Structure formats: structure tokens, C-alpha cells
Amino acid sequence: DMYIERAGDITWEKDAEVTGNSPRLDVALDESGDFSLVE
């Protein structure tokens, strides 16, 4: 049986750790909600 516990508030934090890139990828979404890369 699954259960839930509060983890925090939903707020934008200023001066948060800025990381990660912005890639443009060709994808396909199937009837099972699964993505796959197209080339």
C-alpha cells in the first residue's frame, strides 16, 4: 500500500543552483506513454 509524506513548499528559489543544458531532440510517443529517440 502506497502512502504520502510532505516534502516541502512549492516556491521559486532565487540564487538556486543553475545547471543543465537545452537540447533539441526528435522523439516518438507510443500508446504506452513511452518516449523513444528518432534519428
Binding site: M2, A7, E13, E17, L25, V27
Partner: protein
């Protein structure tokens, strides 16, 4: 039981000890998570029970107690924050500029931050503090890392 607006961990005692399976957003008395986290199964919140209300395997979304309430969208230009809630680790805002998932039915925003699967359901926020989508459904790229779509539902 606990219906306070905020981010929550989705846990289970079926495996060894307590295992985090995902994360979800409580907003307006509705619990919003990704379908693959609960599989549409009922949830427990202390002594209270959360029964599913709306679900969809292709969208990979699910709501509890009421209809989907999150309606904010990524604007295509601004940086966003993933409020990552990783297993056994404290909640954390990670700012990023999302990429694009180009599909046959249109484009979607995409966060390129890699996290364990138990992070699934973590909200992606805009500068106003509004939930623009959920983290947990994307792809594994050439280098093995995960790039998740910004998955948002529809408010009726």
C-alpha cells in the same frame, strides 16, 4: 489526512524497508502525480485515503480526490526550476533552461537534469511559483543520461 498544498513523497512498504517510488503535487485538495508511480492504485495519507479520479497511461498523469488542477505552461523562453525531491534526500530547486522534445503532434519543453527514477512526479516551476509540468517521462540519450519532458495535464 494531510491535504495541505505542497510537494509530497510517494512511498511504499512492499519492498525492503520504506522505498520512495515517486513524488506528487497537492494543490486545491487534489494530488497530482505520474501514472507509472502509482499505477492508479489508492494512496494513504496518515489515517485518510486518496482514491484516483482521473488517469491516462499515454499522458502518464493521474489525479486523486478531484480533476487535474495544474494549468500553467512553459513560455518557450524563460528558465525554469525543477523542485527535485530525490529519495532519502531533501527537496531542492535546480534552475535550468529547457530544451525541446520535437514530436509528430507538436513540440514540448524538456528538462535535461538526470535524477533517480524515484524522483518521478517532481514539479517543474516557473518564476511566479506555478507548476508548469511534472518530471519523470522522457528518454535516455547517447550518453546514458535522462532528459525528461515537461508533462502537463488539462484543466476542465
Amino acid at each position: 489526512g494531510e491535504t495541505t498544498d505542497g510537494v509530497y513523497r510517494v512511498m511504499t512498504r512492499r519492498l525492503l524497508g520504506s522505498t520512495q517510488v515517486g513524488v506528487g503535487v497537492m494543490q486545491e485538495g487534489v494530488f497530482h502525480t505520474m501514472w507509472h508511480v502509482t499505477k492508479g492504485a489508492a494512496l494513504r495519507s496518515g489515517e485518510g485515503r486518496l482514491d484516483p479520479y482521473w488517469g491516462d497511461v499515454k499522458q502518464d498523469l493521474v489525479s486523486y480526490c478531484g480533476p487535474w488542477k495544474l494549468d500553467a505552461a512553459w513560455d518557450g523562453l524563460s528558465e525554469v526550476q525543477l523542485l527535485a525531491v530525490p529519495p532519502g534526500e531533501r527537496a531542492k530547486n535546480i534552475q535550468t533552461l529547457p530544451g525541446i522534445f520535437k514530436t509528430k503532434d507538436g513540440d514540448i519543453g524538456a528538462v535535461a537534469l538526470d535524477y533517480p527514477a524515484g524522483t518521478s512526479g517532481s514539479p517543474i516551476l516557473d518564476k511566479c511559483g506555478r507548476v508548469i509540468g511534472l518530471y519523470g517521462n522522457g528518454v535516455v540519450i547517447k550518453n546514458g543520461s535522462y532528459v525528461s519532458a515537461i508533462t502537463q495535464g488539462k484543466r476542465e
